[PDB]
Amino acid sequence: MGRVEVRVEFEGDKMRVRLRNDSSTPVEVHIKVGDEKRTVTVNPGEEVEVTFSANDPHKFNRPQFTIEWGGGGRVEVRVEFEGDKMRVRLRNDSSTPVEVHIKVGDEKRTVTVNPGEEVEVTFSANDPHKFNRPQFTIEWG
């Protein structure tokens, strides 16, 4: 087994990314929020928070993170907040299939991404403020 949690939090001109590693191995999470690109190592049991800042809160409309882990594994998560919906693309560039759980207020979506596969997850909302604190869990077999 093994779980990796990502929570994105929008608070005005700030965007916090909290990462938990609930797995047996250390992960390296590559974040790219607009022009800014940060990389962090999250060790098992560790919780890491990286805060991003912006002039325009539309720099935050396409956050992207790659949970990479020792032994070439990559899980790519690209978020896209366009209009009334939040679009998420998940790509499993690992040999194990991963299960991805995304929560956004009242709605929670779960998909399986098989190795080499790339799946889309779109949420709709009336108030785009429903996407202010989205969560992502990646559990491997």
Author numbering: 0 to 140
The authors write:
Here, we devise geometrical principles for de novo designing single-chain immunoglobulin dimers, as a tunable two-domain architecture that optimizes biophysical properties through more favorable dimer interfaces. Here, we devise principles for de novo designing single-chain Ig dimers with interfaces diverging from Fvs, as a two-domain Ig architecture that is hard to find in nature and optimizes folding stability. We envisioned that de novo single-chain Ig dimers could be designed through two-layer edge-to-edge dimeric interfaces, resulting in extended Ig β-sandwiches. Key to such robustness is the two-layer edge-to-edge strand pairing at the interface between Ig domains, which involves a high number of backbone-backbone hydrogen bonds and protects oligomerization-prone β-sheet edges from solvent; overall favoring monomeric stability and solubility.
As the seventh (C-terminal) β-strand of each domain was found to be partly disordered and not present in the crystallographic dimer interface, we reasoned that the C-terminal region could be removed and then generated single-chain dimers of 6-stranded Ig monomers connected by a short β-hairpin loop; overall building a 12-stranded β-sandwich (right). To this aim, we removed the last nine residues of each domain, and designed a short loop connection (between 2 and 5 amino acids) between different anchoring residues (W68 or G69 of one monomer with G1 or R2 of the other monomer) by Rosetta fragment-based insertion. We found that the gap could be easily bridged with minimal backbone strain with loops of two or more residues connecting G69 with G1. The design with a two-residue hairpin loop (scIg12) was also found to have a strongly funneled energy landscape by Rosetta ab initio constrained folding simulations. We selected scIg12 for experimental characterization and, as the three scIg14 designs, was found to be well-expressed in E. coli, soluble, and monomeric by SEC-MALS. It had a far-UV circular dichroism spectra characteristic of all-β proteins and was stable at 95 °C or 7 M GdnCl. We succeeded in solving a crystal structure of scIg12 at 2.8 Å resolution by molecular replacement using the design model, and was found in excellent agreement with the computational model across the 12 β-strands (Cα-RMSD of 0.8 Å). A minor deviation was observed in the conformation of the designed connection. At the bottom, the designed linker is surrounded by a tightly packed area stabilized by aromatic stacking, and at the top it was found a cavity binding a glycerol molecule (as crystallization component) that is surrounded by the two β-arch helices (insets). The robustness of the scIg12 scaffold was borne out by nearly identical crystal structures obtained in the absence and presence of a 15-residue binding-loop insertion.
